[PDB]
Amino acid sequence: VKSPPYIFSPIPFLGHAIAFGKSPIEFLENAYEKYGPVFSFTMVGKTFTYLLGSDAAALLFNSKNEDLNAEDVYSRLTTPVFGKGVAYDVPNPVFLEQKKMLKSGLNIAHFKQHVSIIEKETKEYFESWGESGEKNVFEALSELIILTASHCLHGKEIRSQLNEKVAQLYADLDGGFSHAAWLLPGWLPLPSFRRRDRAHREIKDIFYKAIQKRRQSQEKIDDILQTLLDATYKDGRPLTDDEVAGMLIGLLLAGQHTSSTTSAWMGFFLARDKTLQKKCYLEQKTVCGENLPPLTYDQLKDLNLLDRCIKETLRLRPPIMIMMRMARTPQTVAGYTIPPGHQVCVSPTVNQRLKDSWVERLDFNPDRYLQDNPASGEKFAYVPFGAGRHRCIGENFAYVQIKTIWSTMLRLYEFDLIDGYFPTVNYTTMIHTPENPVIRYKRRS
Amino acid sequence: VKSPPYIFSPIPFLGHAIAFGKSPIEFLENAYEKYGPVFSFTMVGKTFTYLLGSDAAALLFNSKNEDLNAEDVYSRLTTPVFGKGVAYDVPNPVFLEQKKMLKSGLNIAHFKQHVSIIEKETKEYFESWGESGEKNVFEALSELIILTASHCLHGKEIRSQLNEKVAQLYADLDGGFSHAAWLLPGWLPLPSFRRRDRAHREIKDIFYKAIQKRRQSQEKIDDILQTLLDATYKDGRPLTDDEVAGMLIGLLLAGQHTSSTTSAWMGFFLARDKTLQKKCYLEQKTVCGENLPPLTYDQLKDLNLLDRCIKETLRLRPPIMIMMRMARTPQTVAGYTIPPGHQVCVSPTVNQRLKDSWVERLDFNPDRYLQDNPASGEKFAYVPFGAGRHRCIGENFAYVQIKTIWSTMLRLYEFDLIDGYFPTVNYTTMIHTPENPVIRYKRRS
Numbered sequence: 001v002k003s004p005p006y007i008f009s010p011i012p013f014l015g016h017a018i019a020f021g022k023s024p025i026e027f028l029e030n031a032y033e034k035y036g037p038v039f040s041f042t043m044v045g046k047t048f049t050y051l052l053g054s055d056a057a058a059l060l061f062n063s064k065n066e067d068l069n070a071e072d073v074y075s076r077l078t079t080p081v082f083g084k085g086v087a088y089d090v091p092n093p094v095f096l097e098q099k100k101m102l103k104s105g106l107n108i109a110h111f112k113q114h115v116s117i118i119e120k121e122t123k124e125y126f127e128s129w130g131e132s133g134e135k136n137v138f139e140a141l142s143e144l145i146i147l148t149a150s151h152c153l154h155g156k157e158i159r160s161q162l163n164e165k166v167a168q169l170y171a172d173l174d175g176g177f178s179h180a181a182w183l184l185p186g187w188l189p190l191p192s193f194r195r196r197d198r199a200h201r202e203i204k205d206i207f208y209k210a211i212q213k214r215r216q217s218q219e220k221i222d223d224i225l226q227t228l229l230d231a232t233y234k235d236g237r238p239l240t241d242d243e244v245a246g247m248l249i250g251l252l253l254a255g256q257h258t259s260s261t262t263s264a265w266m267g268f269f270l271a272r273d274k275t276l277q278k279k280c281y282l283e284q285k286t287v288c289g290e291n292l293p294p295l296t297y298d299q300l301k302d303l304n305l306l307d308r309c310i311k312e313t314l315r316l317r318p319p320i321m322i323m324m325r326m327a328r329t330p331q332t333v334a335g336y337t338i339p340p341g342h343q344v345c346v347s348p349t350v351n352q353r354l355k356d357s358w359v360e361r362l363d364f365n366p367d368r369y370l371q372d373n374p375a376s377g378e379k380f381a382y383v384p385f386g387a388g389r390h391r392c393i394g395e396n397f398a399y400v401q402i403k404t405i406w407s408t409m410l411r412l413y414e415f416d417l418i419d420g421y422f423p424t425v426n427y428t429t430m431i432h433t434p435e436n437p438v439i440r441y442k443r444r445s
Numbered sequence: 446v447k448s449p450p451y452i453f454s455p456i457p458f459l460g461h462a463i464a465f466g467k468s469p470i471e472f473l474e475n476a477y478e479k480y481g482p483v484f485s486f487t488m489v490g491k492t493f494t495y496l497l498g499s500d501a502a503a504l505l506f507n508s509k510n511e512d513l514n515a516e517d518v519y520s521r522l523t524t525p526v527f528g529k530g531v532a533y534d535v536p537n538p539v540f541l542e543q544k545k546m547l548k549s550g551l552n553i554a555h556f557k558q559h560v561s562i563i564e565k566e567t568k569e570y571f572e573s574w575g576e577s578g579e580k581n582v583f584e585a586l587s588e589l590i591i592l593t594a595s596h597c598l599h600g601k602e603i604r605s606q607l608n609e610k611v612a613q614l615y616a617d618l619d620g621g622f623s624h625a626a627w628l629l630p631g632w633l634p635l636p637s638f639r640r641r642d643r644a645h646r647e648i649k650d651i652f653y654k655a656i657q658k659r660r661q662s663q664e665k666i667d668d669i670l671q672t673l674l675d676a677t678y679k680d681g682r683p684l685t686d687d688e689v690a691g692m693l694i695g696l697l698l699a700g701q702h703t704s705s706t707t708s709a710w711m712g713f714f715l716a717r718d719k720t721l722q723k724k725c726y727l728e729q730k731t732v733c734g735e736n737l738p739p740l741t742y743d744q745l746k747d748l749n750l751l752d753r754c755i756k757e758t759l760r761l762r763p764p765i766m767i768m769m770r771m772a773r774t775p776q777t778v779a780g781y782t783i784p785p786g787h788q789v790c791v792s793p794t795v796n797q798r799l800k801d802s803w804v805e806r807l808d809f810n811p812d813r814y815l816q817d818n819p820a821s822g823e824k825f826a827y828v829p830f831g832a833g834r835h836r837c838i839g840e841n842f843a844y845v846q847i848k849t850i851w852s853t854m855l856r857l858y859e860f861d862l863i864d865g866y867f868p869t870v871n872y873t874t875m876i877h878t879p880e881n882p883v884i885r886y887k888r889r890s
């Protein structure tokens with residue numbers, strides 16, 4: 001019995017909070033060099049054990065939630081935002097159920113409907129960018145995705161009510177996943193704490209009556225909202241209007257931030273690699289034809305390069321940069337015993353660019369998958385949607401949304417860096433944001 | 446007319462204070478990769494232009510003090526500590542004559558006195574270390590250097606006044622070389638500013654009566670103190686008591702911090718490379734005789750390996766990490782004009798470890814000089830003592846001190862790392878200080 005290498009720190013309480021805050025990826029890779037796949041360090045009077053590489057990460061992915069707990073760590077931030085009796089508020093077994101329900105709502109039939117829906121929103125949104133210029137993609141994209149994710153995941157009724165004042169109510173809920181909300185106790189009245197709660201009431205308010213306007217009209221609609229309203233536990237019990245509104249919040253935020261960032265990033269990887277951009281456009285005409293008809297689900301599958309570009313964006317810029325659990329009981333990896341109390345973490349970012357396995361690691365090269373790579377050679381080197389019990393459910397949908405949008409976009413414009421500036425990464429927010437994401441765009445010929 | 450490349454910061458007043466603060470070598474090397482030999486950034490209101498590599502740094506080394514000015518940057522820190530009328534308190538031509546007088550004292554005849562003085566001091570000091578154990582070398586060495594430096598640079602009388610309190614006064618003096626003291630204005634009543642001012646007045650006092658005593662008694666002693674007392678500007682004017690006492694302070698602070706740090710790291714480099722350490726010990730027998738008699742100045746020139754070990758230590762661990770100047774008139778390098786007002790900088794650390802010029806840059810290898818290297822091959826790739834109007838005058842004395850000390854130390858002990866630990870660098874204060882610099886030692890065979 002031996003516990004992980006511990007990284008001592010001179011600072012009394014902060015610990016590594018400043019160095020890790022600067023560049024977490026730099027911090028963690030160096031730590032990998034000095035100490036290996038398994039190490040501990042303290043930050044803000046908290047101890048963290050990291051697991052790097054596929055083998056060590058296996059601990060986290062394979063374990064049972066009674067052993068590595070996700071509520072113990074996520075709940076602080078989630079419950080105030082999403083709502084009571086949903087996500088990390090309920091026992092895991094109850095949550096597995098809520099997932100199985102949502103998952104059902106993400107099936108080919110619904111995606112088929114989504115493609116055109118998304119393609120419309122994209123075309124219409126960009127009517128105000130005209131023929132050329134230099135604008136903020138990340139800003140645009142997150143505005144559009146809030147629109148597309150809404151139409152798809154919240155149905156027509158709710159989407160038609162998305163104005164500026166609702167956009168703000170969501171933006172107030174973004175300010176819940178913060179530095180301060182994780183450490184400080186929920187009785188210190190920071191401005192954000194207050195707004196996060198205000199918007200939660202105001203938005204559940206909107207969902208409350210929008211639910212029932214569908215709970216009534218006999219107009220048979222087959223969408224995500226419908227699925228939820230019709231679904232049922234092993235109990236037989238249906239979801240209360242509270243539960244339903246709850247998981248509507250989860251759906252919008254999860255499905256909105258993770259796609260915007262990714263989409264936004266791919267824009268720059270594509271504008272930087274101009275030939276790779278043109279082969280993406282060429283692939284569009286090959287798979288869809290010169291006339292370029294509207295898009296259908298069936299065409300997406302044959303957009304292989306585009307798929308590998310998305311797979312490559314997610315490799316280098318995974319929206320979920322870290323994943324965490326509380327050790328409720330002692331766990332063993334690489335001969336080390338992690339003591340109950342440590343917060344265990346894995347970083348897809350580190351794993352997916354690790355030197356031992358990713359050849360030309362910092363290169364944006366979608367052709368890497370047409371070779372030998374750890375994404376197939378190994379179980380947990382490529383993990384942008386996680387693995388095991390806490391596995392993502394949105395991957396199908398996320399690919400649908402990003403695929404359609406970028407297809408449509410490559411059809412509308414050609415994109416270039418401004419003076420050859422490729423955005424750097426900001427860590428001020430959990431949200432993996434690109435520095436100064438303004439892009440040059442001219443009409444496609 | 447092109448100004449240097451500018452690295453932007455989002456953080457408003459601070460700038461890069463934290464990124465640079467935590468790892469300046471990393472920050473600067475990274476910068477060098479992205480931006481080139483010349484670039485600029487701002488920190489705490491101030492703007493810096495760094496000149497990395499032999500060619501960029503040539504601008505600073507060659508420049509006149511009218512154009513690139515030392516006083517403007519150094520004087521706030523310096524004058525309260527060394528005193529008025531000396532170093533940066535006076536016009537540069539005045540200071541050059543003082544450098545000249547200080548040089549005249551650092552000659553072969555005095556060095557021959559220093560050798561046996563240092564040897565005896567070292568043997569006496571380490572008696573308390575005993576046959577083996579685990580002590581903090583950096584403390585030991587700094588304690589010791591203070592005794593050897595005084596003995597050589599102040600003389601026998603002043604040395605015999607060196608008790609705990611006087612040592613404590615000198616430490617209050619260094620407190621003046623603070624992060625804080627360069628930034629915040631001098632009219633603030635911080636604890637350290639008071640400490641410094643008080644201890645300045647008390648050392649000056651000790652030096653006053655000491656100067657007057659030697660000025661009196663007719664015993665003819667030929668040391669450095671007397672060189673100063675017998676010295677004279679082109680004026681024909683002798684030094685006022687306050688001028689002598691001033692440079693005597695500057696002499697000990699200079700001759701102390703720089704040697705102690707260098708000897709500390711050398712210690713750890715030789716503890717890591719045991720086979721190198723052994724070769725150094727053998728050299729002592731080969732050069733000085735198997736009998737190992739008392740060290741002489743002539744023997745010092747012959748310890749070539751020990752020589753290159755010091756040189757190699759200075760390469761990786763120069764105690765003056767950065768040289769700085771204020772731009773008064775506009776200056777051009779690599780096609781860029783540094784606007785007046787910028788603080789122009791060179792890092793020896795960075796120049797001495799630069800990828801494109803050093804084979805195995807991070808490697809402690811004293812033999813690298815027996816091949817082809819930038820020390821001999823470029824002009825300014827190797828500059829631990831600087832170059833130009835502001836060149837160091839203390840190099841020879843510094844080698845004498847560090848040779849004699851390490852010669853005697855090797856004869857006394859075999860040194861080792863504790864549990865494989867090599868001290869990492871502590872940058873908080875600008876001096877390369879070793880983290881937890883405790884060494885294992887045992888009696889030499």
Ligand SMILES: OC[C@H]1O[C@@H]2O[C@H]3[C@H](O)[C@@H](O)[C@@H](O[C@H]4[C@H](O)[C@@H](O)[C@@H](O[C@H]5[C@H](O)[C@@H](O)[C@@H](O[C@H]6[C@H](O)[C@@H](O)[C@@H](O[C@H]7[C@H](O)[C@@H](O)[C@@H](O[C@H]8[C@H](O)[C@@H](O)[C@@H](O[C@H]1[C@H](O)[C@H]2O)O[C@@H]8CO)O[C@@H]7CO)O[C@@H]6CO)O[C@@H]5CO)O[C@@H]4CO)O[C@@H]3CO
Pocket residue numbers: 003004005006007008009010011035864865866880881
């Ligand atoms: O020896 C070099 C070491 O010295 C410096 O550390 C000082 C530091 O500045 C201060 O923070 C303070 O430390 C106090 C500390 O803050 C408190 O957390 C506590 O420490 C206890 C730990 O909480 C507890 O974990 C346990 O520690 C044991 C470890 O759990 C166990 O893993 C093992 O540790 C070994 C590591 O596994 C291994 O990696 C290696 O450690 C290297 C470090 O990673 C590296 O950072 C460095 O450490 C420096 C440090 O930078 C200095 O600031 O070098 C190490 C290379 O050897 O080796 C570790 C064992 O040496 O064993 C430890 C116990 O030995 O108990 C500790 C207390 O022992 O209280 C601390 C009060 O001292 O002071 C330290 C001491 O100099």
Ligand SMILES: OC[C@H]1O[C@@H]2O[C@H]3[C@H](O)[C@@H](O)[C@@H](O[C@H]4[C@H](O)[C@@H](O)[C@@H](O[C@H]5[C@H](O)[C@@H](O)[C@@H](O[C@H]6[C@H](O)[C@@H](O)[C@@H](O[C@H]7[C@H](O)[C@@H](O)[C@@H](O[C@H]8[C@H](O)[C@@H](O)[C@@H](O[C@H]1[C@H](O)[C@H]2O)O[C@@H]8CO)O[C@@H]7CO)O[C@@H]6CO)O[C@@H]5CO)O[C@@H]4CO)O[C@@H]3CO
Pocket residue numbers: 419420421435436448449450451452453454455456480
């Ligand atoms: O892509 C640009 C940039 O976007 C972000 O920057 C924002 C920043 O966070 C805010 O602080 C603010 O900027 C204010 C700034 O802080 C003030 O100093 C001032 O800026 C003026 C300068 O003081 C002045 O020097 C001059 O700048 C000219 C330079 O002198 C000249 O050398 C050249 O600069 C180019 C460099 O030579 C070249 O290396 C390259 O620099 C890269 C940066 O290092 C990199 O960080 C990135 O910057 C992002 C940044 O990360 C965001 O935070 O861009 C470069 C990569 O190519 O490029 C430089 C530009 O070509 O030219 C400039 C003139 O443009 O003028 C500026 C006034 O613009 O005022 C600012 C008040 O807004 O806002 C910015 C918003 O972008």
Ligand code: HEM
Pocket residue numbers: 070099251254255256258259262314318319320323324383384385386387389390391392393394395397398
């Ligand atoms: C590119 C897009 C996305 C990426 C990269 C992504 C990533 C992830 C990751 C890494 C996890 C695991 C977290 C952990 O184990 O702690 C996860 C889980 C999850 N995701 Fe996503 N996600 C994306 C989009 C979505 C979408 C669109 C939805 C909803 C439709 C969604 C809903 C969920 C849910 C319900 C979980 C499970 C939480 C649990 O069981 O603890 N995600 N996702």
Ligand code: HEM
Pocket residue numbers: 515544547551696699700701703704707759763764765767768769828829830831832834835836837838839840842843
């Ligand atoms: C390990 C030993 C030493 C090293 C590495 C070292 C390094 C340096 C450097 C880099 C400079 C140039 C500063 C600049 O250009 O901004 C300098 C200058 C100087 N040093 Fe040293 N030094 C050492 C020892 C000494 C000693 C022992 C003395 C006293 C005998 C001394 C006295 C001086 C003086 C008077 C200057 C000139 C200041 C000026 O003209 O601006 N140094 N030294």
Ligand SMILES: Clc1ccc(CO[C@@H](Cn2ccnc2)c2ccc(Cl)cc2Cl)cc1
Pocket residue numbers: 073074075077078087247249250251253254255258320323392394
């Ligand atoms: Cl309906 C729903 C229910 C639960 C989640 C958990 O979402 C993830 C983020 N995420 C985004 C997309 N897929 C995952 C998450 C949220 C908050 C925290 Cl503190 C930690 C994590 Cl890992 C998401 C949607």
Ligand SMILES: Clc1ccc(CO[C@@H](Cn2ccnc2)c2ccc(Cl)cc2Cl)cc1
Pocket residue numbers: 518519520522523532692694695696698699700703765767768837839
């Ligand atoms: Cl008598 C005497 C007079 C002047 C100096 C110059 O001292 C250097 C450090 N140093 C130490 C040994 N050789 C140089 C220095 C002093 C102050 C500042 Cl703010 C910055 C620097 Cl780089 C040294 C001795």
